């Protein structure tokens, strides 16, 4: 029966359309923004973790450089 085929497509269509319209419902908008803000923050803390690890490395390395110069006078 054809009306059973049509009804099925009709129902799928409203569903799809409603899914498409859902992206710009206010609640969806906010959750999308919350999601993106959350991923951002995750990354910001990780960038910052790295920044500080590298800065620490710098100071270690700068001290290793001081050691070497000092070592140089104190063998002389």
UniProtKB/Swiss-Prot annotation:
Keywords, ordered alphabetically: Cytoplasm, Endoplasmic reticulum, Membrane, Phosphoprotein, Selenocysteine, Transmembrane, Transmembrane helix, Ubl conjugation
Biological process, per Gene Ontology: cell redox homeostasis; cellular response to insulin stimulus; cellular response to lipopolysaccharide; cellular response to oxidative stress; endoplasmic reticulum unfolded protein response; ER overload response; ERAD pathway; establishment of protein localization
Top-level taxon: Eukaryota
Function: Involved in the degradation process of misfolded endoplasmic reticulum (ER) luminal proteins. Participates in the transfer of misfolded proteins from the ER to the cytosol, where they are destroyed by the proteasome in a ubiquitin-dependent manner. Probably acts by serving as a linker between DERL1, which mediates the retrotranslocation of misfolded proteins into the cytosol, and the ATPase complex VCP, which mediates the translocation and ubiquitination.
Protein known as: Selenoprotein S
Principal location: endoplasmic reticulum
Assembly behavior: Interacts with DERL1 and (via VIM motif) with VCP, suggesting that it forms a membrane complex with DERL1 that serves as a receptor for VCP. Also interacts with DERL2, DERL3 and SELENOK. The SELENOK-SELENOS complex interacts with VCP. Interacts with CCDC47.
Cellular component terms (Gene Ontology): cytoplasmic microtubule; Derlin-1 retrotranslocation complex; Derlin-1-VIMP complex; endoplasmic reticulum; endoplasmic reticulum membrane; low-density lipoprotein particle; plasma membrane; very-low-density lipoprotein particle
Post-translational modification note: Truncated SELENOS proteins produced by failed UGA/Sec decoding are ubiquitinated by the CRL2(KLHDC2) and CRL2(KLHDC3) complexes, which recognizes the glycine (Gly) at the C-terminus of truncated SELENOS proteins. Truncated SELENOS proteins produced by failed UGA/Sec decoding are also ubiquitinated by the CRL5(KLHDC1) complex.
Location of this fragment in the whole protein: 49 to 122 of 189
Family classification: Belongs to the selenoprotein S family.
Location in the cell: Endoplasmic reticulum membrane; Cytoplasm
Alphabetized GO MF terms: antioxidant activity; ATPase binding; enzyme binding; signaling receptor activity; ubiquitin-specific protease binding
């Amino acid at each position: 029966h054809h009306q059973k085929l049509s009804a099925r497509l009709r129902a799928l269509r409203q569903r799809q359309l409603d899914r498409a319209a859902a992206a710009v419902e206010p609640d969806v908008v906010v959750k999308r923004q919350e999601a993106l803000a959350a991923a951002r923050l995750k990354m910001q803390e990780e960038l910052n973790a790295q920044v500080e690890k590298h800065k620490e490395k710098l100071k270690q390395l700068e001290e290793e450089k001081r050691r070497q110069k000092i070592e140089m006078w104190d063998s002389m």
